[model samples]
Target: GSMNRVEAARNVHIVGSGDTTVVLGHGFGTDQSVWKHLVPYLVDSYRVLLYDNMGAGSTNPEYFHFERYSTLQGYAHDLLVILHEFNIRSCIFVGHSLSAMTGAIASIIRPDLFQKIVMLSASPRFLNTADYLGGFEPADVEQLAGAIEANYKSWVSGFAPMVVGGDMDSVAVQEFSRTLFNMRPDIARSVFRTIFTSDLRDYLGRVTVPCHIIQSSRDMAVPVSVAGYIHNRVGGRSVVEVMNTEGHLPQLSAPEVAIPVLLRHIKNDID
Candidate 1:
């Protein structure tokens, strides 16, 4: 408790007091605050842990190191460090987008730390390959990075609406846009390159815990096929559910739809 205090103060926030712990990991461009709506439903029934990726959200910029954080493993290192700090040996880890892959990697490295993993809008690879459909052409991904470099503000304005996938004026879209803009431009660019270029397909099968792959039917960022890919390749027990929804951030766009599915997985054990 004494040693973890300083680190926890800087990066983590603990909520609820239930026996079971649930760790929430947010995707790119967002932070722990994105879980605002869903945390309420969870806090009553479980202990909740939330933290920011070093370069993400309100985390101090000084903590983000370019070389150390240039890969998914860095994020995994942070996740493990947090778990070790609190001496949390078992918990349900819910990760969205890139964090999903981060959680998968962490679980693969330290299976005892995770009882289950719930992935929201996760993709092991974003660029399409010869026999696999990752939903993006190499050129398309390159163009996205180029666009970000050419004009970060314009890219955010256009990309956020497409990724959120609902009325541009809706509150959810507004919130998503706000967080996207909050990231430091250079850090966002580096993180974007790290996430989009990442290929964790081979790593999926190494995970030993139960994994729940949750994806939206019409997410611009993650295609429905990717969910099948993860389900088929992941080791241990795995379940795939395609929500009847749009947007990559359904937890924000459609919490009513996302929560029930998440709850079902959270309560069920690996068979």
Candidate 2:
């Protein structure tokens, strides 16, 4: 708590040099480094800002408050304050999973802060309701919670490859596993609980910022329908680009395939 929010978010880095800024926000368990493959291309043409969420090990865990981050809105406030302190307005926000919803909430609160948002493998909910097939069952979530509590390390061992979606030997799987293991057992459990249980569907209609929905052709976490659902529901003008990629973490697993699409959208944005 001693850390200034700006420093906490900025420690929180700014790179590249351009009049236009691009903010890359990582999801639960992952850190800023997940954007490693995508940054080089953007750095030359746009200023890039990357940060770990409060739960990520790359950021100080002492700053994480379980209840504070219980809702995605908490992260929304952080995104707003971070942008406010840095005077980052009308920036290109590239947000993944949980951060995507965080960006949505922030855009709703202050639409002027973002010129556009690129949601990477984002979803409004994971738990399936009667009508919305959100891709996960309540039993599945309960099992995951039990698995993490049962053996955090073992849970990550299987979880990482599933997230990266190749096999145990995939380099991307290894990369994701390294960061996943960096977080403490308690923090991992709680963060997972928050993200999996959260429902941000009601907030979608209020987001007026332009959104670019980037969906992997296949994702273990998010179904293709959810991508279209987001495009159909967001109050703002939005477009969906289905990348010929695999895994939920396409930016890490297949950045080459995802980068070209990312650039066209960001580059096309004049407002």
Candidate 3:
């Protein structure tokens, strides 16, 4: 059967039977399948929407034109289109890492489409600027860029466990690495580099919808300070719920901690 742009280009699909919609977005190096473990729990009470970002493991790379996706806004455009195509009046957008800013930009574009935004392990910028310390220094950012183009496989080996923030033996490390490794190296190199260099802090103040930030007390990619930064700057009311968890991808690495936090934000009255 033929499908629309969202279905063909981004692999859009919906799961669950409930009327309330929750669109779960994956960040760089991850596809929508990242939400698989958590989908079942939400299915009984809410509709779950999932899709791969342009260069994700499961997405077709031909659709990932470099210049179009050079900025986070491009990704935001794709997200807005998905929501519009589905005729979603509003939704709870759960975005992690790169998609956090993607959804942030989207909400600014179409605030009417968002009920509340759940920023999980999110950061507006990864590189530290004059007034903002986004967890990476100038040297670290370039060094990371070099390592990816130098020997992506080697970088993946070391990066997987470190980003997962647990011992190498943890299954979560394997899960993340597997998806990261699946991405086309060239696209991964470009996408991750774009994510690292882009700054979305100033844009944070434009997010008019309510936001619930779910941050791990410690995450390799986003520091607790970054969580505080977003909470203080966002345009509307926001709450920061810091949880005791390890790794950046808590939903995968520590479902016990992430799931409850997710539901609390999704169901409550944020208005």
Number of clashing residue pairs in every model? 0, 1, 0
Over the stretch 82-138, how does candidate 1's per-residue lDDT look in tens digits? 899888969999999989999999998899989999999999888887998888997
Report the C-alpha displacement of residue 200, candidate 3, in angstroms: 0.9
Q: Please report the TM-score between candidate 2 and the true structure.
A: 0.93
lDDT of 2 by residue, 1-271 (tens): 3545546543588988988899999887788988888898998889998876847763354454445566678888878888988898679999988798899888888888788998989999999989999999988888777888688779989888877887678688898889888777887777788888789998898888889898898898899899999999999798888888899888888877887887888788524
Cα lDDT tens digits for candidate 3, 40-87: 888888888988784775335335444667778888997888898888
Q: Which candidate leads the pack in TM-score?
A: 2
Off by over 4 Å in 2: 1-10, 58-67
Candidate 2: minimum summed lDDT over ten consecutive residues — where? 58-67
TM-score of each: 0.92, 0.93, 0.92
Model 3 ranges off by over 4 Å: 1-6, 58-66
| 1 or 3, greater by lDDT | 1
